[PDB]
Amino acid sequence: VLQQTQRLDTSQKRILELESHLAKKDHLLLEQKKYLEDVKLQARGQLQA
Amino acid sequence: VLQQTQRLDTSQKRILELESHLAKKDHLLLEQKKYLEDVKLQARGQLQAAESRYEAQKRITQVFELEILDLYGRL
Amino acid sequence: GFRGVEEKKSLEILLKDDRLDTEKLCTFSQRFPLPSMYRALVWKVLLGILPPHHESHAKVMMYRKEQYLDVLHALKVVRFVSDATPQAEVYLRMYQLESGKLPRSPSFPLEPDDEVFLAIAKAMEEMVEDSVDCYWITRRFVNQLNTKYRDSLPQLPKAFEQYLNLEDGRLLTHLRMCSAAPKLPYDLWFKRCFAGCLPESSLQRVWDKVVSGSCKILVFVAVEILLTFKIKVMALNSAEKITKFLENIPQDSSDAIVSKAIDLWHKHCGTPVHSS
Amino acid sequence: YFELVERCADQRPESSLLNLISYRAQSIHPAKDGWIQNLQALMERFFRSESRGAVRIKVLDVLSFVLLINRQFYEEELINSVVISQLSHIPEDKDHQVRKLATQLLVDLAEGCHTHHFNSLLDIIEKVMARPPELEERDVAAYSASLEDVKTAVLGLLVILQTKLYTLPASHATRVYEMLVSHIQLHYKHSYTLPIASSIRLQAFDFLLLLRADSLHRLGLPNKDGVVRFSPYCVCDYMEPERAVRLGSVPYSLLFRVLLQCLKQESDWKVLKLVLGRLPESLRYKVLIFTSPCSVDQLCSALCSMLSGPKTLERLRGAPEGFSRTDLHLAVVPVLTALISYHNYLDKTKQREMVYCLEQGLIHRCASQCVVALSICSVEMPDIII
Numbered sequence: 001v002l003q004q005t006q007r008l009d010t011s012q013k014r015i016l017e018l019e020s021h022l023a024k025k026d027h028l029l030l031e032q033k034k035y036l037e038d039v040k041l042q043a044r045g046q047l048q049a
Numbered sequence: 050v051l052q053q054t055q056r057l058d059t060s061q062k063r064i065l066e067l068e069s070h071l072a073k074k075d076h077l078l079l080e081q082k083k084y085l086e087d088v089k090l091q092a093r094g095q096l097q098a099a100e101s102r103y104e105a106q107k108r109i110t111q112v113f114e115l116e117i118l119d120l121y122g123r124l
Numbered sequence: 125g126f127r128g129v130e131e132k133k134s135l136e137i138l139l140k141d142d143r144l145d146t147e148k149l150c151t152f153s154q155r156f157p158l159p160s161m162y163r164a165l166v167w168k169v170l171l172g173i174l175p176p177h178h179e180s181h182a183k184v185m186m187y188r189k190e191q192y193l194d195v196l197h198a199l200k201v202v203r204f205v206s207d208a209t210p211q212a213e214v215y216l217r218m219y220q221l222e223s224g225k226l227p228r229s230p231s232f233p234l235e236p237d238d239e240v241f242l243a244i245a246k247a248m249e250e251m252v253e254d255s256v257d258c259y260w261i262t263r264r265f266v267n268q269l270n271t272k273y274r275d276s277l278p279q280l281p282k283a284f285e286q287y288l289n290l291e292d293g294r295l296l297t298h299l300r301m302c303s304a305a306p307k308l309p310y311d312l313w314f315k316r317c318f319a320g321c322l323p324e325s326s327l328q329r330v331w332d333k334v335v336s337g338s339c340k341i342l343v344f345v346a347v348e349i350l351l352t353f354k355i356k357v358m359a360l361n362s363a364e365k366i367t368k369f370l371e372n373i374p375q376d377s378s379d380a381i382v383s384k385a386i387d388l389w390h391k392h393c394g395t396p397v398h399s400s
Numbered sequence: 401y402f403e404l405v406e407r408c409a410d411q412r413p414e415s416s417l418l419n420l421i422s423y424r425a426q427s428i429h430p431a432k433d434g435w436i437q438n439l440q441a442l443m444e445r446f447f448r449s450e451s452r453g454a455v456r457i458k459v460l461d462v463l464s465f466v467l468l469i470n471r472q473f474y475e476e477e478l479i480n481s482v483v484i485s486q487l488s489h490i491p492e493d494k495d496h497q498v499r500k501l502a503t504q505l506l507v508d509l510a511e512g513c514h515t516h517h518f519n520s521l522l523d524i525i526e527k528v529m530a531r532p533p534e535l536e537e538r539d540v541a542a543y544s545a546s547l548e549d550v551k552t553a554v555l556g557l558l559v560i561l562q563t564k565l566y567t568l569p570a571s572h573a574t575r576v577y578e579m580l581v582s583h584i585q586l587h588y589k590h591s592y593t594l595p596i597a598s599s600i601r602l603q604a605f606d607f608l609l610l611l612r613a614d615s616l617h618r619l620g621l622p623n624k625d626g627v628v629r630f631s632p633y634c635v636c637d638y639m640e641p642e643r644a645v646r647l648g649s650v651p652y653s654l655l656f657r658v659l660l661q662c663l664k665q666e667s668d669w670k671v672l673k674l675v676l677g678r679l680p681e682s683l684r685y686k687v688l689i690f691t692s693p694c695s696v697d698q699l700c701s702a703l704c705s706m707l708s709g710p711k712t713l714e715r716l717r718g719a720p721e722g723f724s725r726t727d728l729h730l731a732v733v734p735v736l737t738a739l740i741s742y743h744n745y746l747d748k749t750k751q752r753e754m755v756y757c758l759e760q761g762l763i764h765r766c767a768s769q770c771v772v773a774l775s776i777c778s779v780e781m782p783d784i785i786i
Contacts, residue, residue: 001050001053004050004053004054004056004057005053007057007061008053008056008057008060011057011060011061011064012060012644012645014060014064015060015063015064015067015645018064018067018068018070018071019067021071022067022070022071022074025071025074025075025078026074028078029074029077029078029081029473032078032081032082032085033081033473033474033477035085036081036084036085036088036430037433038143038177039085039088039089039092040088040092040431040432040433041175041176041177041433042092042175042177042179042180043088043089043092043095043096044433045175045176045177045180045184046096046175046180046183046184046187047092047095047096047099048175049175049183049184049187049188051615051616051617054616055616055617055618055635056645058616058618058632059632059633059645059647060645062632063568063632063633063645066567066568077472077473080472081473084430084431084473087431088430088431091431107194110194110198114198114201117201117202118201121203
């Protein structure tokens, strides 16, 4: 039981770390999505001219 | 002990899944950066394609302009 | 109160961003006047002459200047225009060429659409210094009239008849007793957008709003025209006399006319609210 | 040109609209501005407001290809903008090919979709599965194809469950299991009889009976190689929803209850041959039955009453031409043999009936199984084997 609770606590903390890291990755993906939207908006903005 | 072992295994497989998730999101971010650079490159290609269209039509109008100036000169 | 400073600095903040938010610029243009130094820029951005991204303005203005010079040189080549041709007629011929509606020779009489564009072009000349900028602003404005407001402009006369009563019912009753309501100059007010009716120094305050999506500002400009001339209109007594007076209103009170028309349009259609 | 074709689409031949859709599909990828809006417009015009079958199939295939390529990055945006907004009317759709292909699309999409839009995709699959007094002998076969979308929807639920069981959030597999089970129970509520419904029940039961569980309550399923993978998130255990990593309560009682109804009401022998063929193996896992509101008493009652009365043979259809009460004995005796292990959890009247069924089996070709079973009954059930 003691070994399992040490491992439970460490793995739950690791999960929280990984979830925060994954949230950061998702935020970066959303930012790059709107960066591509911005990029192609600029590109068609002078392609239309 | 069964519940505790189950809680660990949920967490430990979830760690492997979350690490594959972080790896996959990093690889998706990399391929997305590459795709943004490719759409930026296609932007240059399409802009220069439009420029070439304009230059070709400009030359066509140049030939017709010289024809018009010649025909007017002959009047 | 230094509210002019607040307006100018807010617009400079809206213009500082590497990407100009056309929606925020439209809302600002609704809520406030444009400072004259940024009017041509903001009109170009809202009319789509310049795209939202500020970096692209140099290359896009190169494109606009190239297109202007190409169309102008083409009109010179087919001898449609000349150096003597007035700048407004030059813009009209450029617009006709770019829209494929150029006649066989300049001696062909102008169509009503041509006269409307010519009137707006004449008004634009006094507002926009640069010939390329003036032409592009003119063409996009007239194209907005034919595309963004092809259905809205015909409704404007009825909106005039409504809001005119809603601010002074007895005045519209005075007009209808003359049965002159359908003979009022709606083609001037709403096809030519008061071009040639108001001095351009204050017609530009109207056109700020017309560029930013509001053609009801035209309705309220006409309403404030007739409210400002209540002393004269209530002394008018014939349909033709009213029509001729409304096409040649005194220009002294025009600054106040447009100011109070914007006040009336902010009162009846509410104050614009920034989006959350 | 294709703007003109779009503005005269109603009058065009179908191949012209196919070319238009291919062209617009070219226009739909993340490199092009407003590609989501372009796809939404194509979907609206040529699926939502078009009634020709091939054109809608082509636009549905365009959407399928767009999802196949661009679910890498834009899955959520596409689902919100296009799929939920356009395919939601598929249950009311009148084209059978279009409905079948649309639930195949929604299924293939929901299998991988682990966002909070999986519930929205299962909404459309469910409303498809939520599906006559007059039929002529050949018109039965022609009409039968009008339900293949129900088939692809539920066989799609099988694929979706085989994926979603091992992936969070665990409510996804929970909903798929509830839909699969409540639908295979709707079969008995409505007493469906068509061969499509028979095959649906067969395939669904074949998948469902393969749900194993380890000592850790974790559910499991075999891979292609037949090796069981136990789920780290979905557990057979009953949780009351009334007043840490969240865990998927996938209680075996729902599947068990519909197994009871399959024993009591099924008519297709190919299904009972399967349910009886896989019940002994499933009954090995006492974790399944005990951790959920299962009723072993009802199970023994179903099997014993199946053997005791002739009514089962008056209920069965599609059995082999020589099927007899003896064949029913051969099939049920294995389940009773495995059911002996639940003696402490069976009512003694049911134990007496089960012992009586095993005793009755000594007449038939399963005499060896009955004698072996009765030996264990002697050790385990002395107060009733006396």
